[PDB]
Design a protein around this ligand. Sequence first.
Ligand code: NI
Lengths: 80, 80, 80
Amino acid sequence: QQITVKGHVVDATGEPVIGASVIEGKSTNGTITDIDGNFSLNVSANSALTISFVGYKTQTVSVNGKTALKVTLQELEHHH
Amino acid sequence: QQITVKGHVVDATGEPVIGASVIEGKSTNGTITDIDGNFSLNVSANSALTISFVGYKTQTVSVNGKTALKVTLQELEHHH
Amino acid sequence: QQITVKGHVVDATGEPVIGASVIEGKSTNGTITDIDGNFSLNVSANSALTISFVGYKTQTVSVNGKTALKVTLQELEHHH
Ligand code: NI
């Protein structure tokens, strides 16, 4: 009923994003990336992940039945 | 030439948002929500209100000739 | 192969924005506005400038072969 997605989150230069939130859709099922930018989450194969971290644009990525995902976060384009 | 709109502003859990700005369109006619999430503003019946508060997505809501309005603010999806 | 664009950056009231970033597209070719809101940048005539400054919405403006440009920045509509 789920698959286990193992993912890697980087910035545009390919450096790991450490501590990014990775949540299944808008549910309470979520995790954080580790010291290497890696996460593991059990999700529906047809779901989408929301990835966020301070200083970056939040992104929604479709799982598309993939057990391995790479997410490249882009920096925010404003500050206060 | 106006109506008086009495409104209630909440977050997604239904708790009042206290101190939110409620402005007629982009004009200088504005107020703030009280301790109970309530506001009163005199506006054109055909106008729209802009509702904002720190930490939430600004929203525009059509008055649609209504003298009683509920606004549900959603949290921002980034931070810095 | 380039033109020199001389530009003036203001807020909605017409006051200079001092220290705004002015970058050719998403490249490393960039400058900042001076004490009078003015910048000079050498760019492709067919390019676009990205103008940003704390507290304002980032804007992209086409050069359109113009050697003189005015940019009016609008304030951000949220804060944290
Ligand atoms: Ni922000």
